[PDB]
């Protein structure tokens, strides 16, 4: 029940992230649109690890508390394949207060486009199949 | 001095937020640009309350635990005038994981444009006068 | 065999749970003893579904992500008979943080004594048999 | 609201306190030792959720789980004994193994000798904060 509602909101959020990633593949993003892509990454990643946590609670695991726990357990049980990429997302979340520096904003944007988006899509497909 | 270094970065972040606020006064923002305005609010507010915390720490106050404490102390010591607006900023910060919903995003955007931008400008002028 | 080694630990855990259940059939438990019965249910259920997961992995099924997956597969394959009871166990596990409320503690304790203990014992017998025959 | 979470924390801690007091007066049975561990687990779960709720009230919505909450509470002075609060998380992670008498005895020892006092200090600190 609760995990499937979270999954639906995750899909909605990721759809907005995907639109921004597809726009970035068409033309360069403005500095303001880059900040918007980073915000879409923040709300998509937040939903994603909460889908993990909710799913494991549905499975009867109430030991997961945070995003690192949820990510580790997802890798251990095969919900994700790229454990290191998902751990890197947590590091990127911890940098978003520094994106008023163009170099930080560019580096997060590159990781979102080059790695995080496809990982989000794979996780969505995996959880939809479990649902 | 740390709080003055923090203030210089606050000024750079506020300059970026102001570009986006001034753009929003002249035409509708796209959905992605709205999220970027929210991200610029996030990094500008995070710098602003850390200026407050650093400044009061430099004056010998070590009891500030977070942005609400910093805001309360700034109101009591005259660093801000619009106490309720700065408290509303904290409520906005705590909603940013929900900005994939249009109702939420448009509410934060409206507050940034109508109230927070000028409150940030007033704080910049106050702190520069202390520097 | 890994699932058989897990089974031995499950049997040891269940022996401790049974001591407490049989004490609870004899006199009322104190509030603290009720918390202990809940903790023994938690370590016994944890072993039980890991026996399930281990067994199904040995059989060729590696798609089990946690106790609900394990319980569904055990019910489908006949390792357990009372599917609703084992699913209620998962709801009780997920109530663990709330047992400082006396009504929650009393509810889980009632379920452990009236339903879960029997199911744990039947599963032990079933898996012991699978060491020797199908 | 963090203050309602704090009220529940105080209620849970009162139960743990009565169990620790009991253990100071006589040996606990094996079943009572498992109960003491369970009461530690629901008290610790409330404690780090107080920490998370409090920092959310302060405007920090980045804290996710118990390690984050404990680290931020230490950094901001809500707790002083960071090592003990980090040991509590280690003990929580051992919960499935307390049917081994040596595991249970070790957690019980830490609850009585260290965790109870730290829980009390944290209650006092948070009460002072509102
Ligand atoms: P925030 O505290 O995230 O950033 C402050 C640090 O970034 C350095 N920095 C980067 N880019 C600049 C420019 N253009 N001007 C001044 N400082 C900059 C600061 O030196 C801090 O280390
Ligand atoms: P996130 O977990 O913040 O959102 C989940 C809940 O948001 C509500 N919701 C769904 N669809 C919308 C739209 N279009 N606008 C505003 N809010 C929405 C539902 O209650 C979700 O469960
Ligand atoms: P304590 O466990 O009372 O913490 C208060 C919050 O937990 C929720 N709550 C109490 N009891 C339960 C059960 N049995 N299941 C799920 N959630 C529970 C309250 O609603 C408070 O939010
Ligand atoms: P039971 O859960 O004891 O399973 C038997 C095996 O689990 C390992 N084990 C026992 N106790 C612990 C703790 N405290 N932490 C991690 N692993 C544990 C041993 O390998 C047992 O033989
Ligand atoms: Mg953001
Ligand atoms: Mg327990």
């Amino acid at each position: 029940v609760r995990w499937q509602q979270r999954l639906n909101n995750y899909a909605r959020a990721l759809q907005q992230l995907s639109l921004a990633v597809n726009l970035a593949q068409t033309r360069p993003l403005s500095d303001l649109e880059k900040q918007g892509l980073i915000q879409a990454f923040e709300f998509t990643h937040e939903l994603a690890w909460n889908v993990m946590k909710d799913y494991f609670f549905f499975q009867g695991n109430s030991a997961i508390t945070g995003s690192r726990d949820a990510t580790r357990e997802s890798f251990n049980k095969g919900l994700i394949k790229e454990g290191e990429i998902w751990m890197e997302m947590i590091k990127s979340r911890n940098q978003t207060s520094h994106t008023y520096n163009q170099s930080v904003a560019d580096e997060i944007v590159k990781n979102i486009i080059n790695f995080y988006h496809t990982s989000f899509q794979a996780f969505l497909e995996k959880m939809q199949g479990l649902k």
Side-chain angles (χ1 to χ4, degrees), chain A:
Chain A
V1 46
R2 207 203 309 122
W3 87 265
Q4 298 200 358
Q5 282 171 339
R6 191 89 72 167
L7 181 64
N8 280 327
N9 291 313
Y10 170 63
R12 263 209 299 140
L14 171 63
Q15 180 225 267
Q16 299 176 39
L17 180 56
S18 289
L19 285 171
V21 168
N22 293 339
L23 167 61
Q25 199 222 291
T26 301
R27 54 149 179 98
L29 299 178
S30 69
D31 289 344
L32 181 59
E33 287 165 329
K34 282 198 199 163
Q35 302 298 335
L37 182 62
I38 294 162
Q39 174 62 10
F41 157 71
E42 286 176 68
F43 62 56
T44 299
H45 175 258
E46 186 78 2
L47 276 157
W49 77 265
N50 277 288
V51 171
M52 304 173 170
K53 179 173 176 173
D54 287 356
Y55 182 77
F56 286 114
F57 192 82
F58 163 79
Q59 286 293 325
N61 181 341
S62 53
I64 290 169
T65 60
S67 61
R68 285 217 156 71
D69 289 338
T71 301
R72 193 185 308 140
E73 183 72 1
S74 290
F75 181 78
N76 289 344
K77 298 303 197 276
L79 300 186
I80 57 183
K81 291 210 181 235
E82 307 283 308
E84 293 286 38
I85 283 181
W86 284 87
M87 277 331 257
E88 272 272 315
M89 293 184 194
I90 292 168
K91 296 335 154 273
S92 294
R93 294 283 309 274
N94 302 336
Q95 297 294 276
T96 65
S97 82
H98 307 289
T99 65
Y100 66 89
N101 303 294
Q102 207 42 231
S103 74
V104 173
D106 291 347
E107 158 76 346
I108 298 175
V109 161
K110 300 197 208 102
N111 285 322
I112 291 168
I113 289 169
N114 291 334
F115 299 99
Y116 301 163
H117 180 243
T118 67
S119 294
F120 287 139
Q121 282 294 336
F123 179 62
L124 177 65
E125 283 155 20
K126 174 89 185 164
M127 302 313 282
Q128 274 174 347
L130 298 179
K131 170 174 82 193

